[PDB]
Amino acid sequence: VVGGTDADEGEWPWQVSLHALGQGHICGASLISPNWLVSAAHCYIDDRGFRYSDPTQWTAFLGLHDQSQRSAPGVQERRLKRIISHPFFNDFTFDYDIALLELEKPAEYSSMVRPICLPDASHVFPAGKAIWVTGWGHTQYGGTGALILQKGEIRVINQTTCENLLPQQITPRMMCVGFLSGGVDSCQGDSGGPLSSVEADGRIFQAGVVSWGDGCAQRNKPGVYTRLPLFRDWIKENTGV
Ligand SMILES: *[C@@](O)(c1nc2ccccc2s1)[C@H](CCCNC(=N)N)NC(=O)[C@@H](NC(=O)[C@H](Cc1cscn1)NC(=O)CCc1ccccc1)C(C)C
Ligand SMILES: *SC[C@H](NC(=O)CC[C@H](N)C(=O)O)C(=O)NCC(=O)O
Ligand SMILES: [Mg+2]
Incomplete structure (x- = not known):
């Protein structure tokens, strides 16, 4: 920003940080339900060095405030089990740039984590x-x-x-x-x-x-x-x- x-x-409390294995924070997301996030499809495109489309390559941090304090009280760590990029995504114009990410286990609602x-x-x-x-x-x-x-x-x-x-x-x-x-x-x-x-x-x-x-x-x-x-x-x- x-x-x-x-x-x-x-x-x-709906802001989420998405980290790729070995790379730290790559993209943001939003919590919309116990099991689901909204994000941008362009964050989950494979390149020759890394399979960003693969849900097992990611970790979502919910309730995070400071990127250097990822274990602080209230922070929840979750894996992903599925990434759904919009089927009409256009990788040239970035039309339809939206994705849905399924948490591997549900978020726990709290004062720090809320849809x-x-x-x-x-x-x-x-x-x-x-x-x-x-x-x-x-x-x-x-x-x-x-x-x-x-x-x-x-x-x-x-x-x-x-x-x-x-x-x-x-x-x-x-x-x-x-x-x-x-x-x-x-x-x-x-x-x-x-x-x-x-x-x-x-x-x-x-x-x-x-x-x-x-x-x-x-x-x-x-x-x-x-x-x-x-x-x-x-x-x-x-x-x-
Ligand atoms: C988003 O944070 C990111 N996504 C990824 C994915 C993988 C690795 C790194 C990142 S960073 C940003 C958000 C930018 C918001 N910008 C403003 N609000 N002003 N998205 C991007 O970086 C997208 N790319 C661009 O925005 C580029 C940056 C740039 C290179 S030269 C001048 N600006 N924009 C353009 O190239 C402008 C021309 C253009 C051509 C074709 C289509 C769109 C724009 C994202 C990676 C596509
Ligand atoms: S609309 C999504 C959020 N609603 C709730 O979280 C409701 C759960 C409460 N615990 C309850 O209903 O008792 C919401 O309102 N998000 C936006 C906001 O400003 O909080
Ligand atoms: Mg706190």
């Missing part, structure tokens, strides 16, 4: 609405990741404006969130983490998945996120959630 601040311990709410298919997150982004990613483009979980406040950007800022790259599965002036943005290592929106009764709903951007926090280059309401049915059909 660029331009953010330290989160409070337990402030985002985010999922929006109904017909809900619209309106232009201009305040949204929170969280993660352990870089605090500057090309910089270094944060040990302590970071939070930042950004805003939904009109879809036509989004398309014009990034021509020939914004599909209807994508949403721009941030500022045209730059300054606050997600960044490398935040991929797969949730957008958190405070809704009408103060409960937090997931508004998107961190996906990509041109650099980080640059003027006229807002972060691009995978939408959530569009996938409510896909999630229900695949997880029962």
